[PDB]
Amino acid sequence: HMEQLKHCNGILKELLSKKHAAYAWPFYKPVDASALGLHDYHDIIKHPMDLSTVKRKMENRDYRDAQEFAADVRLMFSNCYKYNPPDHDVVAMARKLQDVFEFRYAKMP
Numbered sequence: 001h002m003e004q005l006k007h008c009n010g011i012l013k014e015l016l017s018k019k020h021a022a023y024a025w026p027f028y029k030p031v032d033a034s035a036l037g038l039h040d041y042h043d044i045i046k047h048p049m050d051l052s053t054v055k056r057k058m059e060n061r062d063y064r065d066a067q068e069f070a071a072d073v074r075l076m077f078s079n080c081y082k083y084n085p086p087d088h089d090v091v092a093m094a095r096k097l098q099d100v101f102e103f104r105y106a107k108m109p
């Protein structure tokens with residue numbers, strides 16, 4: 001649906017907005033596993049995902065509906081919960097950004 005993909009663009013703009021920048025910044029671009037020295041990142045995480053990829057796919061018209069967009073946003077959060085130990089800062093940041101996503105996605109007209 002054309003209407004819900006327009007609402008999804010709104011959610012994405014909100015996730016990228018300066019208001020959430022303190023906990024949203026680790027999700028803006030792909031995890032730079034080389035620069036961070038995370039040698040096992042692409043062994044554990046088979047399907048990496050981040051907000052720039054979500055934005056490129058939306059511009060490309062890769063999502064058929066809102067459900068396909070949500071699956072990618074949740075993949076991004078799940079990768080973070082799968083890779084990291086529950087005590088890491090990035091996990092707490094993921095939880096905070098997901099609460100923003102889940103709320104806006106639920107309130108979708």
Ligand SMILES: CCNC(=O)c1cc2c(-c3cc(C(C)(C)O)ccc3Oc3c(C)cc(F)cc3C)cn(C)c(=O)c2[nH]1
Nearest residue numbers: 026027029030031032035036079080083084085088089090
């Ligand atoms: C089990 C160990 N896990 C990690 O080392 C780990 C690092 C990362 C990063 C991440 C990505 C980048 C850049 C922009 C270079 O891509 C920069 C820093 C990042 O993380 C940190 C954050 C958020 C705060 C810190 F004080 C320190 C670090 C390292 C993102 N995501 C989603 C992760 O899931 C992840 N896990």
